[PDB]
Amino acid sequence: SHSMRYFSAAVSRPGRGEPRFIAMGYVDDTQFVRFDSDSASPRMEPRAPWVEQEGPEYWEEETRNTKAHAQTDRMNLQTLRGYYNQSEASSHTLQWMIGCDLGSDGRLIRGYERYAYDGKDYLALNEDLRSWTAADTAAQISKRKCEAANVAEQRRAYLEGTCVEWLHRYLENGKEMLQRADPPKTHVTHHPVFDYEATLRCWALGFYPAEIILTWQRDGEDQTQDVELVETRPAGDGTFQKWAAVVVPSGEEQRYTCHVQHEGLPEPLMLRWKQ
C-alpha cells in the first residue's frame, strides 16, 4: 500500500512580518520536497535523493506553483480572519492536506483534500470527490464558494490523474528506499523490582514504514489494558522505533509473549524474555 501527500501550513504573525508558508510533499512516510517562505530564496527543494533527478523544468514548475499556493493561502488567512471577525493583531494557522492512496494492485483506492484552521477541521472534500463538508458556519461560505465554481472537478482530476501517475513515478525512482520493507529488530528487556514484580519491555527497532503492531500475551492473552505503549518515533536515519511495556509478577516472565506485526515481516513473530 502506498500514498502521496502534500501538506501546507500558513501561519500569520502580526508584527513579525508576512505570514510564513511552508509546503511539503510526502511519499508514504518519506518527505521528498519542501518549500519554506522563510528561506533566503523560497523554492521547492528536494528532501530525498530519488527526486533530485527531476530536471530543471520540474523544479521550475513546482516552485512557481508553490509560490502561487503561498499567495493564495496568505489571502485565505485573511479571508478566514474576516469570517470569524478576528483581531488583526492575532496569529492564526491554516493547514492543508491533499493526497492519493494506491491499493496493493496499484490503482486509486481513495483521495482527499482537507483544511484546518487554528487546529480545527474546517473544510473537507468528501470521499466521492464531488462534494464538500464544512465544519462550521464560516466554512459553509467556503463550501458554497467551491460548489459555485465547480472546483471539485479540478481537484478530482488531479487526484485521479496526476497524483496517481506521479506517485507511480516516484515509487519507481526511489524503489530502493520506498518499496522496501525493513523488518524491526526485536528484543525484550527485563527490569526487576525487588521480590514481587518486573517490567517487561518489548522493543521494535529500525523498521519502515512506521506502521506496526505491538501486543503483550500471557499464556496466550492480550494485556492491552495495563500495557504502556509509546508513540512510534523516528530513529533519525529513516527508520522508526516503538516499545510496549507490561509489569508482571516476578517469576512469571515466561508466561508473557510479545506479538509484533510488521509488513517487512514474513510472519508475525512472538518474543519471550530470556532468563
Binding site: 502534500y6 513546482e62 502561487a68 493564495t72 493561502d73 491533499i98 483544511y115 464558494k145 481537484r155
Partner: peptide, 9 residues
C-alpha cells in the same frame, strides 16, 4: 507533483 493551485476559501 503538487496540484497547480491552492483553493480560494
Amino acid at each position: 507533483r503538487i496540484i497547480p493551485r491552492h483553493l480560494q476559501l
